[PDB]
Amino acid sequence: QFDFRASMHMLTSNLTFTVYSDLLAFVSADTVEPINAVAFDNMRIMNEL
């Protein structure tokens, strides 16, 4: 039997939010001057004149 009162449920959710797809879209990245780019040893990657 269909019992209307017993079949009533209060479904709960968030009132509203926004979903984002590409996080790196919000990051703007640049590089230092390549002449001054350093390696893991804190020295410039290339050093020849």
Add this chain to the structure above:
Amino acid sequence: PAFGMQRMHYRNGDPQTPFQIAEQQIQNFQVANWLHFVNNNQFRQVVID
């Protein structure tokens, strides 16, 4: 190459000039002495007249 030494791996921006490094690394007295003179050859500031 004359003295059979490995090619100098000089870093751009080194505090010392190539001649200053060679002066320490060259065991020949004549070449090293000429290198030392070139390294220290400077103008003399003097008030004249």
